[PDB]
């Protein structure tokens, strides 16, 4: 329960720091700024593929259809968001507190022919600017990771939720207590992208106080994980010449992933909550 | 959290509550002692279809083929865990309390053809008999409510999981504080059948202090709950009335429909390594 201490990170300074890595961030992993998922960890399929993957086992616990108001905290560049506008027809209102990443946003949407069905916009998950229940669901995509006030996020999720909506997130977590020959790398990832790992005990009375229930629990790191770390860092490391224009020499070794491989209490969570009613 | 008053268990009472169930042709040859499970709530599978949907449901999880010894803890009259080898290969062993249960379990392994593959025995969960490292899983179907302590019980199974097996487990817990019109039907029921709930939180902690990470945590009360109960009132309210040519407190099932707030929980806890 943070034996490893942690950043308690600033929802605006995310931002900024958005706005500093997705500029030569999307050259690096590419347009879905999440982990890939993978039947077992000798799949062949390509990253590429995989990441909508879990897009879309997150969009389906959405449970939503043509004329479904979604709501997309964490909008990111835009992919994952524009992807369930399309293939569901649901329409999706995003938000991400960086602004290049709220332009390329609209402009993957712009791109789809979906503007009018895919707006993204800049907002703070711990402020949400939306009436009450003006949603049917909520999908949180590796984005609860970076808040300030988890207790809080929730509190807002669960107002805009109508009744019966369902919440769909990532979050980190400690699978046990953490080796000890690997808090090094996990406290540079966490401190260096401004992110906090929780307790798998914490999210029932965490939802709880949102006014959710949880629905379903799910560690997805044996999927998640290790296979993308090997690849992002086998990405990077292929061109580590092209830091010569990055600024990678001094930010590409804070994103290069290939200290995290092996380190086993690190986990990765997907969550499905339920707010009562419809 | 225990916001009701909650009973605790001897594990020697629940059998000798198991006893007067199974003798009494309730628990009868072939029946599942656990909830139906179903997708919709209007979806009209019976009964029997759904409770072994559920115990399916919970097998796979188990991830076994032929060749696995899987614990029963908690096998009742020994269906599921039969169905289990049946359907499976698997070598099961169940454990019940209730010695009564584990006689007409093995007489329904025999019948089967299995009496070989689903072997059953009279032990109690808080103090498993099995040398360490023994099963490439156990499942728990309706059976850590009736236990003592979960922490121990948790702790035993977790002994004799080899690294990499996985534990299955369906259990009761509070989805959020109770309601008062229906605080008392939830009191009556789990004195009456000696069980106890627990806070969702509670779990990943058991699960740890037994050397087990979780793996899979489902609220799965909105599929198993409620079409159980009304269509266990019925049978109850019908066989009142079919002995018309009296006995009219029996705690009615159906006085739990409507109490959302009431959970059941399926779980799935894995031991590292494998
Ligand atoms: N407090 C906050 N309010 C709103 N958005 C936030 C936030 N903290 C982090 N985010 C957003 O969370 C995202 C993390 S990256 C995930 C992006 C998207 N889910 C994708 O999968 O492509 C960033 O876009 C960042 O802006
Ligand atoms: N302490 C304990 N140790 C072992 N088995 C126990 C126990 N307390 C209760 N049980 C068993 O748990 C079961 C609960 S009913 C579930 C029976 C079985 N899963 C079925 O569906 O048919 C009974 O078999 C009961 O005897
Ligand atoms: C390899 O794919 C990625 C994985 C697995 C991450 O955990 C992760 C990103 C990835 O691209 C960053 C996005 O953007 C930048 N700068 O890389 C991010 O941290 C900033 C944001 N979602 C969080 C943490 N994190």
Redesign the interface.
Known sequence: LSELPMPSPASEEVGALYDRFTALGAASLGENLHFGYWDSPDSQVPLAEATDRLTDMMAERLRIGAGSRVLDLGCGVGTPGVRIARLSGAHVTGISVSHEQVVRANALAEEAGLADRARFQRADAMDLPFEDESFDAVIALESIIHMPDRAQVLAQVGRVLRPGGRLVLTDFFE??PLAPEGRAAVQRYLHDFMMTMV???????LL?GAGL???????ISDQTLEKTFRLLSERINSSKQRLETQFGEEMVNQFDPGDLVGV?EFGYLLLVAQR?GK
């Open positions: 699978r046990a307790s798998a005990e914490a999210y029932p009375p709880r229930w949880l629905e379903e629990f799910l560690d086993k009562p």
